[PDB]
Design an enzyme around this catalytic site. Structure first.
Site, short mmCIF file in Angstrom:
data_model
loop_
_atom_site.label_atom_id
_atom_site.label_comp_id
_atom_site.label_asym_id
_atom_site.label_seq_id
_atom_site.Cartn_x
_atom_site.Cartn_y
_atom_site.Cartn_z
N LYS A 104 0.82 -1.21 0.00
CA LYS A 104 0.00 0.00 0.00
C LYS A 104 0.85 1.26 0.00
CE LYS A 104 -4.39 0.62 -0.33
NZ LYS A 104 -5.24 -0.23 -1.21
N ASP A 144 -6.26 4.15 -6.11
CA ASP A 144 -7.01 4.04 -4.86
C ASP A 144 -7.81 5.32 -4.67
OD1 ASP A 144 -7.24 2.09 -2.45
OD2 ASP A 144 -6.96 4.05 -1.50
N1 LIG Z 1 -9.47 2.69 -5.76
C1 LIG Z 1 -9.51 1.42 -6.12
O1 LIG Z 1 -9.17 1.05 -7.25
C2 LIG Z 1 -9.97 0.43 -5.13
C3 LIG Z 1 -10.17 0.85 -3.84
N2 LIG Z 1 -10.86 0.11 -2.92
C4 LIG Z 1 -11.17 0.67 -1.63
O2 LIG Z 1 -12.36 1.30 -1.54
C5 LIG Z 1 -12.61 2.52 -0.99
C6 LIG Z 1 -13.13 3.58 -1.94
O3 LIG Z 1 -12.35 3.70 -3.10
P1 LIG Z 1 -12.92 4.54 -4.28
O4 LIG Z 1 -14.35 4.09 -4.61
O5 LIG Z 1 -12.00 4.37 -5.52
O6 LIG Z 1 -12.93 6.06 -3.87
P2 LIG Z 1 -12.75 7.22 -4.92
O7 LIG Z 1 -11.25 7.60 -5.00
O8 LIG Z 1 -13.25 6.80 -6.32
O9 LIG Z 1 -13.53 8.51 -4.46
C7 LIG Z 1 -13.88 8.64 -3.11
C8 LIG Z 1 -15.39 8.74 -3.00
O10 LIG Z 1 -15.82 8.34 -1.72
C9 LIG Z 1 -16.22 9.55 -1.10
N3 LIG Z 1 -15.79 9.60 0.29
C10 LIG Z 1 -14.45 9.63 0.88
N4 LIG Z 1 -14.65 9.68 2.26
C11 LIG Z 1 -16.08 9.67 2.48
C12 LIG Z 1 -16.77 9.70 3.62
N5 LIG Z 1 -16.11 9.74 4.89
N6 LIG Z 1 -18.02 9.68 3.55
C13 LIG Z 1 -18.77 9.64 2.48
N7 LIG Z 1 -18.15 9.60 1.21
C14 LIG Z 1 -16.72 9.62 1.30
C15 LIG Z 1 -15.70 10.69 -1.90
O11 LIG Z 1 -16.49 11.82 -1.80
P3 LIG Z 1 -16.26 13.08 -2.69
O12 LIG Z 1 -16.34 12.70 -4.14
O13 LIG Z 1 -17.32 14.12 -2.42
O14 LIG Z 1 -14.89 13.67 -2.41
C16 LIG Z 1 -15.84 10.14 -3.24
O15 LIG Z 1 -17.16 10.18 -3.61
C17 LIG Z 1 -11.23 2.77 -0.46
O16 LIG Z 1 -11.15 2.47 0.88
C18 LIG Z 1 -10.33 1.86 -1.27
O17 LIG Z 1 -9.20 1.51 -0.57
C19 LIG Z 1 -11.26 -1.16 -3.25
C20 LIG Z 1 -11.10 -1.66 -4.45
C21 LIG Z 1 -10.12 -1.07 -5.38
O1 LIG Z 2 -5.90 -2.83 -7.87
C1 LIG Z 2 -4.92 -2.88 -7.10
O2 LIG Z 2 -3.84 -3.42 -7.40
C2 LIG Z 2 -5.06 -2.25 -5.73
C3 LIG Z 2 -6.49 -2.41 -5.24
C4 LIG Z 2 -6.73 -1.46 -4.09
O3 LIG Z 2 -6.24 -0.34 -4.11
C5 LIG Z 2 -7.55 -1.88 -2.96
O4 LIG Z 2 -8.02 -3.04 -2.95
O5 LIG Z 2 -7.77 -1.07 -2.03
#
Ligand SMILES: NC(=O)C1=CN([C@@H]2O[C@H](COP(=O)(O)OP(=O)(O)OC[C@H]3O[C@@H](n4cnc5c(N)ncnc54)[C@H](OP(=O)(O)O)[C@@H]3O)[C@@H](O)[C@H]2O)C=CC1
Ligand SMILES: O=C(O)CCC(=O)C(=O)O
Ligand SMILES: [N+]
Length: 418
Positions: A104, A144
């Site tokens: 990470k 992420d």
């Molecule tokens: N990024 C990835 O490729 C992957 C990530 N994940 C995990 O999933 C989670 C979300 O990732 P992701 O969907 O890409 O997020 P994004 O980077 O796409 O965007 C964040 C979104 O979540 C919102 N957000 C952040 N904090 C809060 C909060 N406290 N309350 C309500 N809404 C919030 C943001 O709001 P706003 O737009 O208004 O700023 C935005 O809408 C993370 O924890 C990540 O580690 C899992 C799979 C892969």
């Molecule tokens: O797609 C990856 O390699 C990382 C996935 C990720 O950021 C997550 O699971 O939070």
């Protein structure tokens, strides 16, 4: 956050290792990240001044292979959060049987206050800072929270410039644009995996998802695509969505595309026409059939664990539910898809992209879709049967599926004798 992200992760690891035969030395090895790199990232602002941010690259274990994990850009980020995310990454890649370890990265920055040029400079400087610990066979970053394929391509270009094109630079990082070594289906990867896990959980519970209700927290790359795919593939009715500024609820259902357009044209989903403005706390407590938290971690605690009324909680986010809250939810008869199993699709398609980059050959949408479905179904059913046979919490069962594999790797490397 209620409690330290890393302390919670260690708590979960111990709580789940209480149901398996693992040596004490292996547990001590697994409770500590194997390498942590804290770096200063200096960039030049638009006004000409130089600003230094704090970057972290934490790999927790690489027994099974090169470490994998995304890069989070967040003002509220802490080294403990990155450590917890890398630890979860390890189990995430172990549960779906990938030749990866857990890693990470992150930068303590508010990307909404940075321009395009500043963001590119930040990505390039981060790569220049952490080049010595990353690589196509050492550590493979990915998108992420608050990072996107754009930043991924900038980072890949910087790494290729530093690496002098000696090897497969395209494979140093995943979630890239398709033009510069991109992978089909990576954009909707984590959402597709979450949808597959939700379908399998409904199958196990004997519930027809057509016409049912799903509430999604967070409207980013995971939340929006999860809502869209649930409305499209599972036939669900999206009744409420949210982002950091609040949420919108509608009993009749929401169209994810219109909500996304409104969010892009206004900055938030608040005040969407035909919908009622609510808070994230209110959205988590809604009467729905599926609840998918896809946002910041630790959203379900003892302050709302008893108020959750969803049949299935799909932890799309990383560690959104505390162990205590896990116990409360399990006592309430609510099925939980574990965090590092529900959203393993994103890393599952990231593993595919890495294979396509080092091989020099690229696949199609159907092949990626088929392989992802196969992997997610196998992992989910393994975890489900694990939790059913031992009569334990879902979260624990996945750990038994995951950690054991990691444990085996150490016994195959000589790291731990017992
Ligand atoms: N990024 C990835 O490729 C992957 C990530 N994940 C995990 O999933 C989670 C979300 O990732 P992701 O969907 O890409 O997020 P994004 O980077 O796409 O965007 C964040 C979104 O979540 C919102 N957000 C952040 N904090 C809060 C909060 N406290 N309350 C309500 N809404 C919030 C943001 O709001 P706003 O737009 O208004 O700023 C935005 O809408 C993370 O924890 C990540 O580690 C899992 C799979 C892969
Ligand atoms: O797609 C990856 O390699 C990382 C996935 C990720 O950021 C997550 O699971 O939070
Ligand atoms: N993932």
């Amino acid at each position: 956050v209620e409690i330290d992200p890393f302390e919670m992760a260690v708590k979960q690891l111990e709580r789940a290792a209480q149901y398996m035969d693992i040596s004490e030395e292996a547990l001590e090895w697994l409770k500590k990240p194997m390498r942590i790199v804290e770096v200063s990232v200096p960039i030049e602002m638009d006004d000409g001044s130089v600003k230094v941010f704090t970057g972290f690259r934490v790999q927790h274990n690489w027994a099974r292979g090169p470490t994998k994990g995304g890069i989070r850009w967040h003002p509220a980020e802490t080294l403990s959060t990155v450590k917890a995310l890398a630890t979860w990454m390890t189990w995430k890649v172990a549960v779906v049987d990938l030749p990866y370890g857990g890693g990470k990265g992150g930068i303590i920055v508010n990307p909404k206050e940075l321009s395009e040029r500043e963001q590119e400079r930040l990505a390039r400087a981060y790569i220049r800072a952490v080049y010595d610990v990353i690589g196509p066979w050492t550590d493979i970053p990915a998108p992420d929270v608050y990072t996107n394929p754009k930043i991924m391509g900038w980072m890949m270009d910087e790494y290729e410039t530093i690496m002098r094109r000696k090897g497969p630079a395209f494979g140093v990082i995943t979630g890239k644009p398709l033009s510069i070594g991109g992978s089909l289906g990576r954009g909707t990867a984590t959402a597709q995996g979450a949808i597959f896990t939700i379908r399998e959980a409904a199958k196990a519970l004997g519930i027809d998802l057509k016409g049912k209700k799903i509430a999604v927290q967070g409207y980013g790359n995971a939340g929006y695509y999860t809502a869209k795919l649930a409305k499209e593939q599972l036939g669900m009715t999206v009744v409420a969505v949210s982002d950091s500024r609040g949420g919108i609820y509608n009993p009749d259902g929401l169209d994810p595309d219109e909500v996304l357009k409104w969010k892009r044209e206004h900055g938030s989903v608040k005040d969407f026409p035909g919908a009622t403005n609510i808070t994230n706390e209110e959205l988590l407590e809604l009467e729905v059939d599926v609840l998918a938290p896809a946002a910041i971690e630790e959203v379900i605690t003892e302050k709302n664990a008893d108020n959750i009324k969803a049949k299935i909680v799909a932890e799309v986010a990383n560690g959104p539910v505390t162990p205590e809250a896990d116990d409360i939810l399990r006592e309430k008869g609510i099925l939980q898809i574990p965090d590092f199993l529900c959203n393993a699709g994103g890393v599952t398609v990231s593993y595919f992209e890495w294979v396509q980059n080092i091989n020099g050959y690229y696949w199609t949408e159907e092949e990626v879709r088929e392989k992802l479905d196969k992997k997610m179904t196998k992992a989910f059913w393994e975890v489900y049967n694990t939790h059913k046979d031992k009569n334990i919490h879902m979260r624990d069962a996945a750990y038994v599926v995951a950690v054991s594999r990691v444990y085996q790797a150490m016994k195959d490397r000589g790291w731990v004798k017992k």
